[PDB]
C-alpha cells in the first residue's frame, strides 16, 4: 500500500531520479525497486545506491504510494509522467516535479525549483514552499501546454506562470512576478498577492483572478465591468478587464471572446 524511501548516501551532484513514480513502483519486488535505473552526471546509478526502502507497493499505481523522507533537495524529475497514485516529498525538491503528469498527486512539504508541473494534464500538487518560475509552463517551443489539473503553490511564485496554458488551474497563495499567463488560451490563475505586472500579455483567451495589486498594468487591457466572483473564496467584487487587445482573438458563435483579467 505504501513505500518508504530514505536517503542514506548523499550524491555530490544532481540525481535525475525520473524512475521514482507509482507507475514504475507498482507491483515490483523490493530488490527490483532498489535496482530501478537512476542517472547522475554521465553515470547511471541503480537507485539502491542512494536510498533505503521499507514497504510494500501495490499491484497498481493507483494503489501504491511513495514517501521520500530525506534531503531530496538536489533530486529532479520526481513524479514525471505519473499516471495515478501518490507521492510525498518530506523535504523540499528540485526541477520538473510532476512533469507531464496525468493523474494522482504530489505533496511537496517544502520548496521547489523551476519547471514545476511542466505540461501537466491532471492531478494535484500541494507545495507549501516558494516555488520558482515556470510553474505550469509549457515546454520550450510548444503551443499547447498545461491542459488540466491543479497546482497550489503556497508561497512566492516567479516568472512565466501558466505560459501557453490551455486548461486547468494554477493557484498561487502568495504573490508572483512578471509574465503571468502569456500566450495562454484557457484556464484560470488565482494569484493572491502583489504582482509586478505584465499579467495577461499575448493572451488569446483565459481568466486570471488577482487579489493583490498590479503595479504595472499592460496597455492591452481595458476595464469594462465590476462583477462579484467566488474564486477559491467568496464574494470579492472584482472589476474585470477585457482581453489582450494587442493580440488576435478567437471568435465563437456570433461573439468575440476576450481573455478577461480580473482584479481586486
Amino acid at each position: 500500500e505504501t513505500i518508504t524511501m530514505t536517503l542514506v548516501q548523499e550524491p555530490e551532484l544532481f540525481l535525475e531520479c525520473y524512475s521514482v513514480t507509482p507507475d514504475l513502483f507498482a507491483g515490483k519486488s523490493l530488490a527490483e525497486i532498489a535496482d530501478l535505473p537512476a542517472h547522475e552526471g554521465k553515470i547511471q546509478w541503480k537507485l539502491g545506491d542512494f536510498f533505503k526502502f521499507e514497504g510494500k507497493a501495490g499491484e497498481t499505481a493507483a494503489d501504491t504510494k511513495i514517501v521520500v523522507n530525506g534531503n531530496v533537495r538536489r533530486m529532479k524529475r520526481f513524479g514525471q509522467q505519473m499516471t495515478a497514485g501518490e507521492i510525498i516529498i518530506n523535504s523540499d525538491a528540485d526541477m520538473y516535479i510532476g512533469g507531464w503528469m496525468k493523474g494522482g498527486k504530489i505533496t511537496v512539504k517544502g520548496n521547489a525549483d523551476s519547471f514545476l508541473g511542466i505540461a501537466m494534464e491532471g492531478g494535484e500538487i500541494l507545495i507549501e514552499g516558494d516555488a520558482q518560475n515556470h510553474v505550469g509552463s509549457a515546454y520550450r517551443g510548444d503551443w499547447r501546454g498545461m491542459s488540466g489539473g491543479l497546482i497550489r503553490v503556497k508561497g512566492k511564485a516567479g516568472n512565466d506562470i501558466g505560459t501557453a496554458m490551455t486548461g486547468g488551474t494554477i493557484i498561487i497563495e502568495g504573490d508572483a512576478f512578471i509574465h503571468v499567463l502569456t500566450h495562454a488560451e484557457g484556464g484560470t490563475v488565482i494569484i493572491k498577492g502583489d504582482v509586478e505586472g505584465r499579467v495577461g500579455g499575448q493572451m488569446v483567451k483565459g481568466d486570471a483572478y488577482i487579489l493583490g495589486n498590479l503595479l504595472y498594468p499592460l496597455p492591452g487591457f481595458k476595464k469594462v465591468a465590476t462583477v462579484e466572483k467566488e474564486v477559491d473564496g467568496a464574494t470579492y467584487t472584482f472589476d474585470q478587464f477585457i482581453g489582450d487587445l494587442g493580440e488576435r482573438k478567437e471568435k465563437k458563435k456570433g461573439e468575440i471572446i476576450y481573455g478577461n483579467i480580473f482584479l481586486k
Binding site: 500579455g201 492591452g220 488576435r248
Partner: protein, 438 residues
C-alpha cells in the same frame, strides 16, 4: 607589398569580407589594412604579432605557469574529460564551423554539457523564436529594398560599426537608388546613442518597459489605438501614432534588436512580443525582424548543432544517446550557480571576464582548461592554456553572418611554427579519448 583581397574581419556579427590586406614580402607581417573598422584593424594587428603563444602552459604547484607539449596537454584533457562526471564545454562564439563540429563530436564521446555564448547573449531570442517564429531576411534584402529601419534596443554605431554603411542605411541599393534620403530610421533606447544621432526619430523609452511599448504599438496596428493611455513607457501617444503610421505605410520594413531586449526584464518575452508585432505588420506591409548577433560565427554553433543534435544551445549530452535542451536547467550560468558541473573548458570565449563573478567563483572549484590564441582572463585563471589558431587570420573556414549567410573566410598569415587549430586539436582529443576506450 603582396596585396590580398577579400579577407574576413573576425569580430562582429557583420562578418565583413570587403577587407584588403597588404602582407609583407615574406608573407608573415601585415603592413596596411584597408576598408575595415578600428576594432578589426586591431584584430589583424594582433594576429600579425611577433611575440605570441606557441605551446601550452600548465599550472605547477608553486602557482606559476610552465609550458608543456601538445601531446601532454591532449593527454591531460582527455583523461580529465573521461574521469569527470558532467564536464561543461563553453564558448564557440569565435571559431570556424568545423571547430563547432569537432567540439560536438568530442563532447558526444565524453558525455558532458556542450554550450555556447548564445545562452548569455541572444539565447533569450532563440527561446522566443521557439515560441513565435523568426520572420527574417538576409542583409542584402534590406540593402536593396528597405524603406523603414528600426533599431530597437540596439546600438550599431558601437556594436557593429560598418553595419550602417554596409547593409542598412547609407548604401544605395537597387530599389533604393536614392540611398539614405528615402529611408526612415527609428531608434528606440533610453540613451541618446550615436545610432540615435544618425537616426531621424528617437523614442527615448524607460529602461525595462519595452513590453508595454510593444503592446501599445500592436494595439495601434490592430486598429483601436484610441484605447492607449496618455503616455506609454515614457513615450507620448502622438509620437506612438506617428511611428506606427510610418510603419504601416512602409513598403518594406526591417527591425533589428539587441541587448535592450535580450538582457532586460522578460528576456524572451520582449523578443516574442517583437516577433508578434512583425507578424502583425506583415498583414498590411512587409516587415522582417532580425537579431543583432554578436560574434562572427556565433550563428555557427546554432546551425551546426541544429544539424547534429537538433538543438541550437544548452545541450544535455549526458544520456549518451538522446540529448535534451531546457535553457533554465541546462545552461552554463544556471549550472555554474547550482554547482552542477565538474569541469569547465574555455574554447573561443572569455568566461572569467564576461561571466558574473559569483558564477566564476562557483566554477573555479573544479579544473579549468582554456583553448585561446592569446592571453585573457580565462587563460589567467585556468589550469592549462592550450594555444590555437585565429579564425580568418591564421586559418580559414566558413563563418555565419548575422542572418545565417555563410561567408568563406581566407587565411592571410601562416600560424606560428607548432601551433595547430581547434579542429585538429579537438579531433586529436577525441582520438585520444577513444584510445582510452570511453
Amino acid at each position: 607589398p603582396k596585396v590580398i583581397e577579400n579577407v574576413g574581419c573576425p569580430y562582429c556579427g557583420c562578418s565583413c569580407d570587403d577587407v584588403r590586406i597588404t602582407v609583407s614580402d615574406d608573407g608573415k607581417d601585415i603592413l596596411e589594412v584597408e576598408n575595415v573598422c578600428a576594432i578589426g584593424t586591431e584584430i589583424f594587428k594582433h594576429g600579425c604579432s611577433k611575440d605570441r603563444i606557441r605551446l601550452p602552459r600548465m599550472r605547477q604547484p608553486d602557482g606559476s605557469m610552465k609550458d608543456i607539449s601538445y601531446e601532454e596537454a591532449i593527454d591531460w584533457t582527455a583523461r580529465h574529460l573521461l574521469k569527470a562526471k558532467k564536464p561543461l564545454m563553453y564558448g564557440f562564439g569565435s571559431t570556424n564551423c568545423e571547430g563547432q563540429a569537432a567540439a560536438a563530436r568530442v563532447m558526444e564521446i565524453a558525455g558532458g554539457m556542450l554550450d555556447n555564448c548564445a545562452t548569455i547573449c541572444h539565447g533569450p531570442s532563440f527561446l522566443a523564436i521557439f515560441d513565435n517564429g523568426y520572420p527574417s531576411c538576409t542583409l542584402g534584402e534590406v540593402k536593396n529594398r528597405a524603406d523603414v529601419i528600426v533599431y530597437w534596443g540596439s546600438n550599431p554605431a558601437h556594436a557593429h560599426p560598418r553595419h550602417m554603411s554596409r547593409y542598412s542605411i547609407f548604401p544605395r541599393g537597387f530599389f533604393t537608388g536614392k540611398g539614405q534620403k528615402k529611408r526612415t530610421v527609428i531608434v528606440i533606447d533610453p540613451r541618446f546613442t550615436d545610432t540615435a544621432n544618425v537616426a531621424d526619430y528617437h523614442l527615448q523609452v524607460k529602461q525595462g518597459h519595452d513590453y508595454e511599448l510593444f503592446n501599445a504599438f500592436r494595439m495601434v496596428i490592430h486598429g483601436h489605438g484610441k484605447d492607449l493611455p496618455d503616455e506609454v513607457a515614457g513615450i507620448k501617444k502622438e509620437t506612438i501614432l506617428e511611428v506606427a503610421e510610418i510603419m504601416k505605410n512602409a513598403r518594406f520594413g526591417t527591425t533589428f534588436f539587441g541587448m535592450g531586449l535580450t538582457h532586460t526584464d522578460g528576456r524572451n518575452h520582449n523578443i516574442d512580443i517583437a516577433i508578434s508585432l512583425t507578424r502583425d505588420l506583415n498583414k498590411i506591409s512587409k516587415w522582417t525582424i532580425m537579431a543583432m548577433r554578436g560574434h562572427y560565427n556565433i550563428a555557427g554553433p546554432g546551425v551546426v548543432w541544429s544539424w547534429t543534435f537538433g538543438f541550437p544551445y544548452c545541450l544535455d549530452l549526458t544520456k549518451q544517446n538522446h540529448a535534451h535542451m531546457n535553457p533554465g536547467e541546462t545552461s552554463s550560468v544556471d549550472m555554474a550557480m547550482r554547482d552542477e558541473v565538474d569541469m569547465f573548458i574555455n574554447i573561443g570565449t572569455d568566461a572569467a571576464a564576461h561571466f558574473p563573478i559569483p558564477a566564476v567563483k562557483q566554477l573555479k572549484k573544479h579544473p579549468w582548461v582554456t583553448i585561446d590564441p592569446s592571453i585573457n582572463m580565462a587563460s589567467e585563471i585556468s589550469d592549462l592554456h592550450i594555444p590555437v589558431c585565429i579564425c580568418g587570420v591564421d586559418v580559414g573556414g566558413i563563418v555565419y553572418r548575422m542572418d545565417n549567410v555563410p561567408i568563406q573566410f581566407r587565411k592571410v598569415i601562416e600560424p606560428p611554427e607548432g601551433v595547430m587549430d581547434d579542429e585538429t586539436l579537438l579531433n586529436k582529443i577525441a582520438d585520444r579519448m577513444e584510445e582510452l576506450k570511453a
